[PDB]
Write a protein that binds this ligand. Structure first.
Ligand SMILES: [K+]
Ligand SMILES: [K+]
Ligand SMILES: [K+]
Ligand SMILES: [K+]
Ligand SMILES: [K+]
Ligand SMILES: [K+]
Ligand SMILES: [K+]
Ligand SMILES: [K+]
Ligand SMILES: [Mg+2]
Ligand SMILES: [Mg+2]
Ligand SMILES: [Mg+2]
Ligand SMILES: [Mg+2]
Ligand SMILES: [Mg+2]
Ligand SMILES: [Mg+2]
Ligand SMILES: [Mg+2]
Ligand SMILES: [Mg+2]
Ligand SMILES: [Mg+2]
Ligand SMILES: [Mg+2]
Ligand SMILES: [Mg+2]
Ligand SMILES: [Mg+2]
Ligand SMILES: [Mg+2]
Ligand SMILES: [Mg+2]
Ligand SMILES: [Mg+2]
Ligand SMILES: [Mg+2]
Ligand SMILES: [Mg+2]
Ligand SMILES: [Mg+2]
Ligand SMILES: [Mg+2]
Ligand SMILES: [Mg+2]
Ligand SMILES: [Mg+2]
Ligand SMILES: [Mg+2]
Ligand SMILES: [Mg+2]
Ligand SMILES: [Mg+2]
Ligand SMILES: [Mg+2]
Ligand SMILES: [Mg+2]
Ligand SMILES: [Mg+2]
Ligand SMILES: [Mg+2]
Ligand SMILES: [Mg+2]
Ligand SMILES: [Mg+2]
Ligand SMILES: [Mg+2]
Ligand SMILES: [Mg+2]
Ligand SMILES: [Mg+2]
Ligand SMILES: [Mg+2]
Ligand SMILES: [Mg+2]
Ligand SMILES: [Mg+2]
Ligand SMILES: [Mg+2]
Ligand SMILES: [Mg+2]
Ligand SMILES: [Mg+2]
Ligand SMILES: [Mg+2]
Ligand SMILES: [Mg+2]
Ligand SMILES: [Mg+2]
Ligand SMILES: [Mg+2]
Ligand SMILES: [Mg+2]
Ligand SMILES: [Mg+2]
Ligand SMILES: [Mg+2]
Ligand SMILES: [Mg+2]
Ligand SMILES: [Mg+2]
Ligand SMILES: [Mg+2]
Ligand SMILES: [Mg+2]
Ligand SMILES: [Mg+2]
Ligand SMILES: [Mg+2]
Ligand SMILES: [Mg+2]
Ligand SMILES: [Mg+2]
Ligand SMILES: [Mg+2]
Ligand SMILES: [Mg+2]
Ligand code: NA
Ligand code: NA
Ligand code: NA
Ligand code: NA
Ligand code: NA
Ligand code: NA
Ligand code: NA
Lengths: 114, 57, 128, 123
RNA sequence: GUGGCACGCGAGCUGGGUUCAGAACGUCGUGAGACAGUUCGGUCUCUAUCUGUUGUGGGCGCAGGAAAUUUGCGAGGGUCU
RNA sequence: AACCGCGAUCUCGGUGAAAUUGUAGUAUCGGUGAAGAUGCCGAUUACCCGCAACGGGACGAAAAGACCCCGUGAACCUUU
RNA sequence: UAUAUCGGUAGGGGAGCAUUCCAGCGACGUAGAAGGGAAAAGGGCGACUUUUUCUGGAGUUUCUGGAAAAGCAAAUGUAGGUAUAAGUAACGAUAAAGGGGGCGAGAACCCCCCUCGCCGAAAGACCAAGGUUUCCUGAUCAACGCUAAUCGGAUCAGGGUUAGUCGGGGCCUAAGGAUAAGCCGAAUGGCGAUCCGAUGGAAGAACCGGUUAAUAUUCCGGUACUGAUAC
RNA sequence: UACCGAUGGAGUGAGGGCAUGGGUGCUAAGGUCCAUGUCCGAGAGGAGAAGAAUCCGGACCACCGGCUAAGGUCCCGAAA
RNA sequence: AGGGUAGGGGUGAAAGGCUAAUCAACUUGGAGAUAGCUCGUACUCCCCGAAAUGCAUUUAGGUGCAGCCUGUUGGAUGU
RNA sequence: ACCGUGAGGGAAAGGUGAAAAGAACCUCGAACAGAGGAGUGCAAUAGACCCUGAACCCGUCUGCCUACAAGCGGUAGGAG
RNA sequence: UAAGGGCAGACGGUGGAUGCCUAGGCUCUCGGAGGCGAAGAAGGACGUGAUAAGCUGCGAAAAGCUGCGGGAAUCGGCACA
């Protein structure tokens, strides 16, 4: 018998083209252009999921550095003192305390200020 | 000589920005109460500056 | 009964719209669209004067379409329109079927000529 | 550049332009008002007022000078007959140009040019 | 003056030279033909999209709307004998 | 070299093609690099959109280089 | 349950999804099938799958097994449709146009008049080849006409070509061709003196005038002539 | 921890850079010909401004947790 | 104006000119000739994973056999 | 059909509705050119190119953004 | 302030994909039959209707003429008379 999968073949394209809405010009709707654009974006997304962790750690470190300099120390000295004293609070929590709970950050600094 | 690439819809529309039909310069002629082109003979009554210029029987 | 119900809903909706259409006008949609953009949003009597004295060829057909739309409004509202009451509330120009022609070119080559048509739609309403 | 060049060529060779001006002048003398393009009427005014001024000297010499421009004996007879007596003692400005509208076929700006003393309504 | 810029520059020009089909001389080859050679003749295509460059406008901005006169951040020209 | 005339050209009304075209919000300099960069790096410059004019670049368009070599490809020509 | 392992081109291996049709078993559908638009949810993972709603208005589908015209992004790939360059090149000889009236809803271009210009061993008037109704009139302006058009060699319908003397044919032969008697030759056939064959030779034989929207040496009025046929 | 027998299916038979030992070349070449390793080929991630094979390091997927490599801690740019 | 010469055949005051815009003809068929050459080859996830060397070859950008991969099996031996 | 002197080559083109019941009549307009109505019909967004009516391509409206800004146009963050 | 532009949604336009449908193809099976023509063939030309004929039929007796058998109310072929 003769088999042509017209509906399935068209439905695959339509499903992918729902994902390329918002793109610029022909890259949103022209299919060969749109499908080309969408796959390069997927490679970018794989790379950026890895880079997001580095970016957020850098942001935490910068906020901790500013709060430590307000308290009288630097980031490297503060982190060395915390590691020596065995305090396991991570940089995300430390940055959150520095931004939003300065009294708690101050007590943490005063703990290792010796 | 030859376009290296086709123009996008955006580029074409940006060029067409200055394509516009011109509005005619229309005066009202309050006596006859209808439009005509400023500095022309009012084609309905045949008047111009309050004087019969063209007489239509 | 489904399509009958849908048609009845649409027929009730059309009673509150006042519009006229020109279909298959054998002229360039782009050149017609210039005139449409000139008169969009404008009071009807001024629009009639503008179309009467415009320097574009398409304005002559747009003027008769506008007169037809005003007449449709008058019939649907069962009264004559007053002075400055109506305005061009919507206008659009779409492309229509193209006639394809062949024109000879040097050295035996033949090139295609497109003779384009358009549709025009005009909605009038009151400046409420 | 065309600094101080003071006549319109009207898209014609010189002989064609002169012949057209002569024909227009005869038509304007015979029928007292004609409908033309605005540019042609403005050129015709400069051409035709000196010819009308020449009738203020009623002489065979002035008749021959006018005929050298017209080459139309009917127009010459009408001009040195009725037109002369009508435009007598008017110090120039015998014609008037009024704009009317635009042509369908090419959008040309149209007007009429007329002899002033034959429009009673405009005095 | 000496050099660089695709020995600058043929979508700027030219076509003397060079690459082509005709023909001839010298030389080589049995020949078809050939040449550290010579000689006469021999179609130079494209409507400028992007960028670049030379000019000239429209829009908006500059605390609300304007008419004038201006300072000069800078740029270019000039520099021979 | 200057000037002149008409046709083309420019502006307006009517009709309306083509070659070309992966998508483009398509700047400069020096670097780098499949060794000659609008698209990478570091700087620099640059308000948004047209029109006229010129051809430096887009190794611009055109015909799967005719030169060169290759194929146990082809044709035609010569000959002891 | 632990430990170990899990980057990959050529390439080898494994396990699946969708599509068309068939058998068996179940089902759905005018109280709305397939298809098309929108939205939501799901899958060790994925190919894909469910559900809601609008359009649509008549068919579709689950599981198990069977069979294939069984899946596209590129081949200077093919068909159809639509873009870009672009409202750009161009509208086809630089013999040239101006005005007044008419008709018409609409006029630079159509009709009439005046003026202007071009050809005039032609761009005037005829015969032949070739074309084949393009000729004239009434309606029509969709398409065709490189613009518009009331106009046209355009569309539709009606009309229009009249010969004893004009042209041809009937008659004759040239080149050449087809043949007879004969000759040659695997076949199909090839030759070969009467016939065919004009571009040539005979033709049996007029003009004048008038008349149609469109034919005229053909129709008509005169004037003639030619060939056969019965006394 | 997968080396041999026998069998089913292959692809490859244009390699390249670096280090080391040499020939050739001019102790030239991002040159060329062998040998021994290694990497790119078929290999992403980090530093070196940007660099196929130099320095570090072999990516099952997710994480807004932590420790390190080479290399760094004045600002662009994480840390004296 | 009519006629004749037809494919490597005709014709050529000779250029390999011309033989219906085709010439070191056209149409149809053998025919889907052959092309060790170029280009192209479409759903999904999982496991493994090379070579660009040697020998031979009218062979050198092709191929045969080794070398190096993979599946399934039986032995112990590989680093 | 078309192309070619000829031998020969050689297309594109199906679907209103159950039934023509195929839209009397009115309005704008020179005109159905076209449309708005009325009426028929289950349905006219089934109105003659007429079932369904996708993409490319072309418009209108509404929301947000945009005239100090520079590279494959996404991707990961993130106010209003 | 948006001259213009970008994205999204809604709604249209164009175009004619898709789904559904079809006696138009394709491959076969069985049984026949395997020619037509000088009593003029195959294949054509011109005609033929109340009204122009594009097909179909027919042939100056021209969408038809005669006889026998069958059948019983419509018929006067198709291109929406
Ligand atoms: K089905
Ligand atoms: K190409
Ligand atoms: K090697
Ligand atoms: K050998
Ligand atoms: K329907
Ligand atoms: K139906
Ligand atoms: K649609
Ligand atoms: K972005
Ligand atoms: Mg990390
Ligand atoms: Mg413009
Ligand atoms: Mg048109
Ligand atoms: Mg006009
Ligand atoms: Mg020609
Ligand atoms: Mg000129
Ligand atoms: Mg040079
Ligand atoms: Mg050149
Ligand atoms: Mg150049
Ligand atoms: Mg030679
Ligand atoms: Mg010469
Ligand atoms: Mg120009
Ligand atoms: Mg124009
Ligand atoms: Mg460089
Ligand atoms: Mg550069
Ligand atoms: Mg480039
Ligand atoms: Mg090139
Ligand atoms: Mg090549
Ligand atoms: Mg790993
Ligand atoms: Mg793997
Ligand atoms: Mg429903
Ligand atoms: Mg297939
Ligand atoms: Mg496909
Ligand atoms: Mg090409
Ligand atoms: Mg241009
Ligand atoms: Mg041309
Ligand atoms: Mg032009
Ligand atoms: Mg003549
Ligand atoms: Mg005629
Ligand atoms: Mg007529
Ligand atoms: Mg026309
Ligand atoms: Mg006619
Ligand atoms: Mg004879
Ligand atoms: Mg005649
Ligand atoms: Mg080899
Ligand atoms: Mg080798
Ligand atoms: Mg090397
Ligand atoms: Mg490789
Ligand atoms: Mg490796
Ligand atoms: Mg640490
Ligand atoms: Mg820092
Ligand atoms: Mg030669
Ligand atoms: Mg030839
Ligand atoms: Mg064979
Ligand atoms: Mg072949
Ligand atoms: Mg082979
Ligand atoms: Mg592995
Ligand atoms: Mg092998
Ligand atoms: Mg009409
Ligand atoms: Mg519908
Ligand atoms: Mg439909
Ligand atoms: Mg700035
Ligand atoms: Mg801003
Ligand atoms: Mg917008
Ligand atoms: Mg749509
Ligand atoms: Mg009979
Ligand atoms: Na010799
Ligand atoms: Na102010
Ligand atoms: Na497999
Ligand atoms: Na003739
Ligand atoms: Na004839
Ligand atoms: Na109607
Ligand atoms: Na806008």
């Amino acid at each position: 018998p003769r088999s042509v999968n017209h509906v399935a073949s068209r439905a695959k394209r339509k499903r992918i083209l729902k994902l390329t809405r918002g793109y610029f010009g022909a890259r949103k709707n022209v299919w060969t252009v749109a499908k080309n654009t969408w796959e390069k974006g997927l490679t970018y997304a794989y790379r950026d999921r890895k880079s997001k962790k580095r970016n957020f750690r850098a942001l935490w470190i910068q906020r901790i550095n500013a709060a430590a300099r307000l308290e009288g120390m630097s980031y490297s000295r503060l982190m060395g003192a915390l590691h020596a004293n065995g305090i396991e609070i991570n940089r995300k929590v430390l940055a959150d305390l520095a931004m939003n709970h300065p009294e708690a950050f101050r007590a943490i600094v005063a703990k290792v200020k010796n | 000589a030859h376009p290296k690439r086709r123009q996008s819809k955006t580029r074409t529309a940006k060029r067409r920005t200055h394509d516009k039909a011109v509005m005619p310069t229309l005066a009202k002629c309050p006596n006859c109460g209808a439009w005509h082109i400023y500095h022309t003979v009012c084609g309905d009554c045949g008047y111009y500056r309050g004087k019969l210029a063209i007489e239509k029987e | 009964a489904r399509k009958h119900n849908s048609a009845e809903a649409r027929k009730e909706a059309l009673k509150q719209m006042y519009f006229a259409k020109l279909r298959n006008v054998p002229t360039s949609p782009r050149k017609m669209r210039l005139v449409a953009d000139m008169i969009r949003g404008m009071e009807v009597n001024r629009a009639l004067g503008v179309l009467k004295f415009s320097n574009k060829e398409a304005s002559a057909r747009v003027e008769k379409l506008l007169r037809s739309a005003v007449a449709n409004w008058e019939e649907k509202n069962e009264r004559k329109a007053e002075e400055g009451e109506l305005f061009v509330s919507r206008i659009c120009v779409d492309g229509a079927s193209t006639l394809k022609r062949l024109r000879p070119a040097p050295q035996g080559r033949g090139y295609r000529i497109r003779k384009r048509s358009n549709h025009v739609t005009i909605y009038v309403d009151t400046l409420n | 550049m065309r600094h101080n060049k003071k006549f319109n060529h009207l898209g014609r060779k010189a002989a064609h332009r002169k012949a057209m001006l002569s024909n227009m002048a005869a038509s304007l003398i015979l029928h007292k008002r004609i409908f033309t393009t605005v540019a042609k009427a403005k050129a015709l005014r400069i051409y035709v007022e000196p010819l009308l001024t020449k009738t203020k000297e009623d002489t065979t010499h002035s008749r021959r000078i006018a005929f050298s421009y017209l080459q139309n004996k009917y127009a010459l007879k009408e001009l040195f007959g009725d037109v002369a007596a009508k435009i007598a003692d008017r110090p120039g400005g015998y014609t008037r140009i009024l704009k009317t509208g635009y042509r369908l076929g090419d959008n040309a700006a149209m007007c009429f040019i007329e002899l002033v003393d034959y429009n009673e309504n405009m005095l």
